[PDB]
Amino acid sequence: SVIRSIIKSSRLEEDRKRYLMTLLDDIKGANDLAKFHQMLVKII
């Protein structure tokens, strides 16, 4: 939910936050999620 919320709150990727939502929501790894979060949030 944490990462799911941030990407959904990421006002840049429309369909990509939607797509990445159904992806990350399925990501059952807390550490890997955090890395994906650090990833895109450092991208922007």
Encoded amino acid at 2, one letter:
V
**How many domains, in total, are found in the chain?**
1
Amino acid at 8: K
Our CA dihedral for 41, 8, 4, 7, rounded to 10 degrees, sits at -10
Containing domain of residue 22, as a range?
1-44
Q: How was this structure determined?
A: NMR
Q: Is the dihedral of CA 5, 9, 10, 14 positive or negative?
A: positive
Residue 20 CB neighbours (<10 A): 19
**Can you give the CATH number for the domain in which 21 is found?**
1.10.8.10
The tokens of 15 are what? 């369909």
